[PDB]
Scaffold this active site. Structure first.
Site, PDB file in Angstrom:
ATOM      1  N   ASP A   1      12.852   3.780  11.287  1.00  0.00           N
ATOM      2  CA  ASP A   1      11.953   2.870  12.004  1.00  0.00           C
ATOM      3  C   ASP A   1      11.022   3.728  12.852  1.00  0.00           C
ATOM      4  O   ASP A   1      11.480   4.394  13.781  1.00  0.00           O
ATOM      5  CB  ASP A   1      12.763   1.912  12.876  1.00  0.00           C
ATOM      6  CG  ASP A   1      11.908   0.904  13.596  1.00  0.00           C
ATOM      7  OD1 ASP A   1      10.711   1.189  13.818  1.00  0.00           O
ATOM      8  OD2 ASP A   1      12.459  -0.159  13.966  1.00  0.00           O
ATOM      9  N   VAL A   2       9.717   3.712  12.545  1.00  0.00           N
ATOM     10  CA  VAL A   2       8.782   4.613  13.218  1.00  0.00           C
ATOM     11  C   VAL A   2       8.606   4.297  14.695  1.00  0.00           C
ATOM     12  O   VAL A   2       8.062   5.128  15.431  1.00  0.00           O
ATOM     13  CB  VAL A   2       7.403   4.630  12.517  1.00  0.00           C
ATOM     14  CG1 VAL A   2       7.526   5.193  11.072  1.00  0.00           C
ATOM     15  CG2 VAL A   2       6.746   3.224  12.515  1.00  0.00           C
TER      16      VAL A   2
ATOM     17  N   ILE B   1      -6.536  -5.842   0.561  1.00  0.00           N
ATOM     18  CA  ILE B   1      -5.717  -5.320  -0.528  1.00  0.00           C
ATOM     19  C   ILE B   1      -4.591  -6.309  -0.832  1.00  0.00           C
ATOM     20  O   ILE B   1      -3.948  -6.827   0.087  1.00  0.00           O
ATOM     21  CB  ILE B   1      -5.121  -3.944  -0.172  1.00  0.00           C
ATOM     22  CG1 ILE B   1      -6.214  -2.980   0.314  1.00  0.00           C
ATOM     23  CG2 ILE B   1      -4.378  -3.363  -1.362  1.00  0.00           C
ATOM     24  CD1 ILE B   1      -7.392  -2.837  -0.641  1.00  0.00           C
TER      25      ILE B   1
ATOM     26  N   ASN C   1       1.252   4.892   7.208  1.00  0.00           N
ATOM     27  CA  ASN C   1       0.933   3.614   6.604  1.00  0.00           C
ATOM     28  C   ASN C   1       1.662   2.435   7.233  1.00  0.00           C
ATOM     29  O   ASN C   1       1.111   1.337   7.232  1.00  0.00           O
ATOM     30  CB  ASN C   1       1.244   3.681   5.096  1.00  0.00           C
ATOM     31  CG  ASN C   1       1.223   2.344   4.421  1.00  0.00           C
ATOM     32  OD1 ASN C   1       0.159   1.828   4.064  1.00  0.00           O
ATOM     33  ND2 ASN C   1       2.404   1.807   4.167  1.00  0.00           N
TER      34      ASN C   1
ATOM     35  N   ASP D   1      11.043   3.970   5.402  1.00  0.00           N
ATOM     36  CA  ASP D   1      10.866   2.543   5.645  1.00  0.00           C
ATOM     37  C   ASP D   1      11.986   2.078   6.560  1.00  0.00           C
ATOM     38  O   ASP D   1      13.049   2.704   6.624  1.00  0.00           O
ATOM     39  CB  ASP D   1      10.847   1.712   4.349  1.00  0.00           C
ATOM     40  CG  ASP D   1       9.958   0.477   4.460  1.00  0.00           C
ATOM     41  OD1 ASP D   1      10.359  -0.502   5.162  1.00  0.00           O
ATOM     42  OD2 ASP D   1       8.857   0.492   3.840  1.00  0.00           O
TER      43      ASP D   1
ATOM     44  N   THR E   1      -1.127  -7.295  -1.467  1.00  0.00           N
ATOM     45  CA  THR E   1       0.181  -6.751  -1.105  1.00  0.00           C
ATOM     46  C   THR E   1       1.122  -7.887  -0.738  1.00  0.00           C
ATOM     47  O   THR E   1       0.651  -8.991  -0.449  1.00  0.00           O
ATOM     48  CB  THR E   1       0.079  -5.839   0.108  1.00  0.00           C
ATOM     49  OG1 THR E   1      -0.235  -6.637   1.252  1.00  0.00           O
ATOM     50  CG2 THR E   1      -0.998  -4.756  -0.056  1.00  0.00           C
TER      51      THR E   1
ATOM     52  N   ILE F   1       0.838  -1.198   0.000  1.00  0.00           N
ATOM     53  CA  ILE F   1       0.000   0.000   0.000  1.00  0.00           C
ATOM     54  C   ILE F   1       0.876   1.254   0.000  1.00  0.00           C
ATOM     55  O   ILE F   1       0.689   2.165  -0.817  1.00  0.00           O
ATOM     56  CB  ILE F   1      -0.985  -0.040   1.191  1.00  0.00           C
ATOM     57  CG1 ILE F   1      -2.018  -1.146   0.958  1.00  0.00           C
ATOM     58  CG2 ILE F   1      -1.722   1.293   1.362  1.00  0.00           C
ATOM     59  CD1 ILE F   1      -2.799  -1.514   2.151  1.00  0.00           C
TER      60      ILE F   1
ATOM     61  N   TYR G   1      -4.312  -7.104  16.642  1.00  0.00           N
ATOM     62  CA  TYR G   1      -4.389  -6.284  15.433  1.00  0.00           C
ATOM     63  C   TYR G   1      -5.666  -5.451  15.418  1.00  0.00           C
ATOM     64  O   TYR G   1      -5.628  -4.226  15.227  1.00  0.00           O
ATOM     65  CB  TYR G   1      -4.319  -7.169  14.174  1.00  0.00           C
ATOM     66  CG  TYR G   1      -4.396  -6.371  12.877  1.00  0.00           C
ATOM     67  CD1 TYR G   1      -3.272  -5.746  12.367  1.00  0.00           C
ATOM     68  CD2 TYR G   1      -5.595  -6.247  12.173  1.00  0.00           C
ATOM     69  CE1 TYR G   1      -3.323  -5.007  11.174  1.00  0.00           C
ATOM     70  CE2 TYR G   1      -5.656  -5.514  10.991  1.00  0.00           C
ATOM     71  CZ  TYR G   1      -4.512  -4.892  10.498  1.00  0.00           C
ATOM     72  OH  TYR G   1      -4.539  -4.166   9.331  1.00  0.00           O
TER      73      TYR G   1
END
Ligand code: NAD
Ligand code: NAD
Ligand code: NAD
Ligand code: NAD
Ligand code: 9MH
Ligand code: 9MH
Ligand code: 9MH
Ligand code: 9MH
Ligand code: NA
Ligand code: NA
Ligand code: NA
Ligand code: NA
Lengths: 255, 255, 255, 255
Positions: free
Chosen positions: A58-59, A183, A85, A36, A185, A17, A150
């Site tokens: 790395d978020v 989706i 995302n 990313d 992916t 995505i 999740y």
């Protein structure tokens, strides 16, 4: 030219995505920063697309995210849109197979990483009357089997979007989310590959949609560009990109 | 060029939201048929916009609607999108001030006129893998004071959108709705002009939105063009264009 | 006698909503275990109510919760219903005034404490075809100003309820939530007491409801008893106990 | 004794959900008026139940409904609750097989009959601080295949419930709805009997629920009694009695 002269950060932009959203914004005239934690996808996308550049980040690491924002400003002079995302869906897990610690770790990526980049970016978004786009999930709203952690993380992202929309509306900053359904992916492919019958699992996934197929990253990308560039009276909304999976009765199991 | 080569019918297209949607589709490259029961607004728009033409048609008259469709095909050779915008909000009415007959008449415009044009157009939409866009209302979902008939008609339109999406998905025809909140149009102006303090009523309307203003027809138009031209995995959705009015607590009236 | 012979655990049962739910279940014939991290309210309730007993237990401490469950079984021989009511609303906080660490701590009480007691209790609920009741919030669904962390935790609880309902339905265990709006409790009183004008803040809170008052703990309690004892075809639902605050337009701030 | 001394009117009370609601209110201590357009079921129920009486009344006939209300007051001296249950689901119909006239007729029963009895009863409900309970449907919210008119009528009832709740809240009259999913009734049996494989159609219906069975009229009845007698802070809500059918992904039909 719908978003010409604008600067966009997309997290998890290296594949799936995220990469679809990167391509949609470049196609609209914007300059895009690809964040990313993995180098391979994103670095190739940087070479492929004039107008896109890659920053390893790395978020879940606050200092990675601080650097992400400060480099975006240093290199491009403004920041107009953040697309949160980056996120993960674990393999299917029965509730008694989960752990408090696994749940905390998933909250760290899917919820707090979004929170942290949003927080560090908002000063700059206020200056540009920019906007935030979070990638949640349809399953936050309707639930999903074997995915209690999740599902809870995406319920939190959708609710957080509405709270933040409230707080930022006086400052002209819009905050919206997209809730994709199935989706197609690399993550979908990886989860299916773990199942007894991968192809049957993929057929099941396609037919969960009245439209009879899964969605594409480009379609999520088009929805993102719309929210950024044209939805100036939309804030706090949840835009469903699901192919109709939430509609009608199905197979979920006389009185 | 987002919708170049496409043919769009917009009902109630002569002013307000409808005229905004007309302009948005012409700006996207499409040819537009303006349907209205009143000549004045729509005929002027025909002269203003190359690519737009006006056809007089009352959507509550089945033979008007049949002619609308057959002339669109005769003049342009295809039909790609129908936007069911024609509708009315009566002045505020207490529940005991309503009548079964007034309720039936409002159902005739706001619900059955949409039903009838959708029905006569679907054969042609199937051939083009076209799509339907209904203009409902936020108040169908959250309710509104002194508007029991209006609110019930928009609840019906939103639900009907989801049912029809289900039925038409095998044929590749998408069916979606937009639920605007307070949009500044000649109808809003006319209702405010009936109240004791028009300006106070308009101030109230602006502040019902976290964004502090009402919306514009052009913003509803942009949402329409997105659904038609780019939302290929969206069907049966309700796209809110409300400025956040459904969010948070407000003034609606110790334990 | 609606829930005679049944055994119920209520977390945060020492005051407020929790104490109201305790009283409602005792009035229905059940034996109730009051869990609280504070001794004062709950110990007095134990002395007041035949059929209620108090167990000190901090739901964020896994070993406290393990002991809570094992003592309930040891003393009463079964477990039929768990009511996850313990939770906290921080004082109003602007988004830039929050911290990742404060957010984690709030997730620990409002989300993970619910998760942990549910997990340790489910084996026993399966044996009794028992049920889970989570106390979420209306603001999880519609958002709230100056409460990004709180709102996100309740969005997660509501979504988690639906996921767990899915997973436990084959075993006959129902999982539902109640989303109260403004209820008059010691927490509401404490937050109002922090504001510049406590009485104005309380007047504001009352008038956010079409009904013009706040709700009572007993009303949340009646909703709980209904879900436990009579809602045998309800699972995964969100029962709103809000006085209509989510309905219609209000004051949230020409085009 | 939960609703002792109270007087309740139930439309369509002669069989199915309606008869279940009648029995639930009699069991709670109330006196019940059974309205039905057919004599057979309701007259037998009158003889069976002390506290229930039968009045022939077609809710689409305004003068039948006027007489229904005036006889309830004449015989019992007050009116506390109206349950608008009368309604119909046509056999499955493709959208191009429907007619504007069939749609109007269905609106006449499922929507306007509810409107008319509510209107004639509200003066008396205001005097008693009574309440209204409408029986809508889950399919009003999520849609259903081959039922565009039915789905639109129930969308309208759910929205109307919220509007009327708003208008009647100053007068202390609560207005709520119940949205059942698949409930096993003579109407369900009659529709299944029209299908190629009745038993397969019934198996399909059971498995649309995570709980794996359909619901019972008594369960809808218990929900009704709760709204009437105990939900004093609930107004404008939609209480789902569906067994979880709206939860999760199912079978509704790679990218
Ligand atoms: N695929 C679907 O059906 C689907 C449906 C609903 C929601 N979503 C959501 O969409 C988003 C993207 O999903 P996808 O299917 O494209 O996934 P994906 O696994 O294919 O790609 C996700 C990308 O994010 C990156 N990423 C992961 N952790 C990161 C971190 N800590 N920091 C930075 N980047 C990180 C990965 O390296 C990868 O490049 C996720 O938030 C997911 O929850 C996906
Ligand atoms: N203005 C708002 O705040 C608002 C909010 C939510 C929904 N809506 C909906 O948006 C739509 C348009 O509203 P608006 O404010 O632009 O209204 P408007 O009154 O300004 O214009 C409506 C147009 O429809 C035409 N029309 C009316 N009856 C017709 C008929 N029988 N046949 C053909 N045309 C007919 C009128 O002639 C007019 O040109 C309506 O469906 C309304 O319910 C409006
Ligand atoms: N009051 C409202 O308007 C309102 C509205 C919506 C939701 N809620 C929710 O209702 C629940 C109860 O709220 P309230 O207003 O009665 O609160 P309250 O503060 O008045 O009482 C909560 C009780 O929980 C206990 N508690 C707190 N942390 C605990 C822990 N770690 N372990 C065990 N017990 C703990 C406290 O000691 C107290 O006895 C919360 O989950 C809250 O989020 C309240
Ligand atoms: N059965 C389900 O699965 C289901 C699900 C969702 C909603 N509903 C709703 O529940 C309600 C009752 O459904 P049911 O399955 O018990 O139906 P049913 O057909 O078994 O019984 C309905 C009763 O209403 C009566 N009735 C019909 N038209 C009437 C009129 N004009 N005036 C007076 N009485 C009239 C009939 O005579 C009958 O006694 C309906 O509103 C229906 O839409 C049913
Ligand atoms: N437990 C039955 C079972 O086979 N589940 C499975 C199997 C394979 C999957 C492949 C991918 C995904 C996925 O990541 C996903 C899907 C939908 C979402 F709305 C969302 O946010 C995420 N979910 C899957 C779920
Ligand atoms: N009863 C108090 C009171 O002043 N109400 C008023 C007063 C003036 C208005 C002007 C216009 C509109 C209107 O058409 C409208 C608004 C919002 C919608 F979502 C929608 O579909 C339609 N509603 C109004 C409502
Ligand atoms: N920022 C303006 C401002 O005065 N906010 C305030 C002020 C005082 C309050 C007192 C209590 C509560 C509360 O705990 C609460 C309320 C509603 C909920 F649905 C919920 O889950 C929790 N919220 C308050 C919010
Ligand atoms: N088109 C496929 C197909 O077999 N549909 C069918 C077949 C048989 C049915 C039997 C009864 C019902 C029914 O009345 C009903 C069901 C659910 C609702 F929420 C509701 O309000 C009403 N619906 C049915 C639908
Ligand atoms: Na590049
Ligand atoms: Na022209
Ligand atoms: Na005791
Ligand atoms: Na009798």
């Amino acid at each position: 030219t719908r978003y010409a002269g604008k600067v966009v950060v997309v997290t998890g932009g290296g594949r799936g995505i995220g990469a679809g959203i990167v391509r949609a914004f470049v196609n609209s005239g914007a300059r895009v920063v690809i964040c990313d934690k993995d180098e391979s996808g994103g670095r190739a996308l940087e070479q492929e697309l004039p107008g896109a550049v890659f920053i390893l980040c790395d978020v879940t690491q606050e200092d990675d995210v601080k650097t992400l924002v400060s480099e975006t400003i240093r290199r491009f002079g403004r920041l107009d849109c953040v697309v949160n995302n980056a996120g993960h869906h674990p393999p299917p897990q029965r509730p008694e197979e989960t752990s408090a610690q696994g749940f905390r770790q998933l909250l760290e990526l899917n919820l707090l990483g979004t929170y942290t980049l949003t927080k560090l970016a908002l000063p700059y978004l206020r200056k540009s009357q920019g906007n935030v786009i979070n990638i949640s999930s349809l399953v936050g709203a309707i639930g999903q089997a074997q995915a209690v952690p999740y599902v809870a993380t995406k319920g939190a992202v959708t609710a957080m979007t509405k709270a933040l929309a409230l707080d930022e509306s006086p400052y002209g900053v819009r905050v919206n989310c997209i809730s994709p359904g199935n989706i197609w992916t690399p993550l979908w492919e990886e989860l299916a590959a773990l199942m007894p019958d991968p192809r049957a699992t993929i057929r099941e996934g396609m037919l969960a949609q009245p439209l009879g197929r899964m969605g594409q990253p480009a379609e999520v990308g088009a929805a993102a560009v719309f929210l950024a560039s044209e939805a100036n009276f939309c804030t706090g909304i949840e835009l469903l990109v699901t192919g109709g999976a939430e509609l009608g009765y199905g197979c979920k199991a006389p009185d």
